[PDB]
Design a protein around this ligand. Structure first.
Ligand SMILES: Cc1nccc2c1[nH]c1ccccc12
Length: 377
């Protein structure tokens, strides 16, 4: 927290909205950089990079009753913070929808320009960021001008917001990596397309050599057998030949049996890593006691050029679970899986935050891969 109080004494914020976003997000971000064992230098580097690069693209501060373009990151904000736990270490991640005030006053109805503004700044501070996939995929997964012509005023009453892009800055200790989330819900409300046809069609359009055709077919076959539609997509803002594509689903059937069905793609994933992860999920689910504005379960399946099979990850809704028990269960989990550093922090804070989701992935290369997504008060 010292790094937040320090930069507060030295940062000049151009408007009241960047100022309010800083005193809202930076204190929690400071505590997560400390808990993640970030060197004091990278604590100042990432807090200042948040104020310089991220706070301008957060739009007007969404005070109670303010008529602004809204988002649901962290439940009610344009910015959401999550922490990742694995044996190699804890890393913080910031996720946000780039937005400028014009979207709140009728000069960018579907908020298509601010992601381009933000990328033009981000690429000046992080030279490794590559936005080629943003140019290739935006046409396939967002509302184009043509789609806007064929679109009626008759998605929002069930999904609430007009969001189509979300950027995630994974604050790795070796350097930031950026990821982009495309939400084709609005594009599909105009073309009548399904989420799967949009996302899987987008991956096949980019993968012109068909490296990922085997992996999309396996996931697609499960989706129509399970009768589930793809929700959205994600990419790594890197060279398009070395990126990881992820397809997400949300399932209002929150049962362990359903999550186990999705985790294995209906039995199509039979490798050893999926079996071990399946085992750990059953324990974690039963340990936490996931209960049956109802949050569903979510999963994504990752595709890379060299990989022969997709790789699942499950998102468990931590609603209704006492925060003391998530702490009690996570501490014991890190202890029993050789993560004494993460077990130590949770043990020290077993001694005001709101944990909303716990995600799980597994390779025995890197061990258990878990993330906690927090919501703003
Ligand atoms: C920032 C963001 N973008 C896309 C998807 C998700 C997200 N945060 C999440 C938390 C739990 C489950 C899914 C998501």
């Amino acid at each position: 927290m010292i790094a937040y109080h320090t930069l507060t004494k030295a940062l000049l914020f151009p408007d009241i909205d960047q100022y309010q976003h800083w005193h809202h997000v930076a204190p929690m971000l400071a505590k997560m950089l400390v808990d993640g064992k970030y060197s004091i230098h990278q604590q100042y580097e990432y807090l200042c990079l948040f104020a310089q690069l991220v706070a301008p693209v957060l739009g007007p501060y969404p005070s109670p009753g303010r008529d602004v373009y809204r988002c649901t990151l962290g439940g009610n904000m344009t910015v959401e913070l999550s922490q990742n736990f694995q044996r190699s270490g804890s890393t913080t991640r910031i996720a946000f929808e780039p937005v400028r005030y014009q979207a709140s006053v009728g000069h960018d109805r579907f908020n298509r320009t601010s992601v381009n503004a933000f990328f033009s700044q981000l690429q000046l501070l992080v030279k490794s960021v590559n936005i080629e996939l943003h140019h290739l995929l935006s046409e396939h997964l967002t509302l184009t001008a043509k789609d806007e012509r064929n679109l009626n005023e008759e998605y929002l009453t069930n999904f609430q917001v007009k969001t189509q892009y979300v950027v995630a800055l994974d604050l790795r200790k070796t350097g930031i990596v950026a990821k982009e989330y495309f939400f084709p819900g609005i594009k599909c409300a105009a073309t009548g397309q399904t989420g799967s046809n949009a996302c899987f069609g987008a991956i096949r359009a980019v993968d012109k050599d068909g490296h990922l055709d085997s992996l999309c077919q396996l996931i697609e076959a499960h989706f129509q057998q399970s009768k589930i539609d793809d929700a959205f997509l994600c990419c790594d803002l890197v060279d398009p030949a070395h990126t990881r594509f992820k397809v997400y689903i949300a399932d209002p059937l929150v049962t362990l049996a359903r999550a186990e069905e999705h985790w294995t793609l209906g039995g199509r994933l039979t490798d050893e890593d999926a079996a071990v992860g399946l085992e750990i999920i059953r324990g974690l689910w039963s340990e936490l006691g996931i209960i049956q504005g109802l949050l569903p379960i979510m999963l994504n399946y990752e595709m890379k050029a060299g990989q022969r099979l997709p790789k699942p990850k499950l998102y468990m809704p931590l609603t209704g679970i006492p925060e003391t028990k998530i702490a009690r269960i996570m501490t014991a989990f890190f202890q029993r899986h050789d993560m004494p550093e993460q077990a130590e922090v949770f043990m020290e804070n077993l001694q005001t935050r709101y944990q909303a989701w716990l995600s799980f992935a597994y390779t025995k290369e890197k061990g258990p891969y878990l993330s906690i997504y927090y919501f703003w008060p």
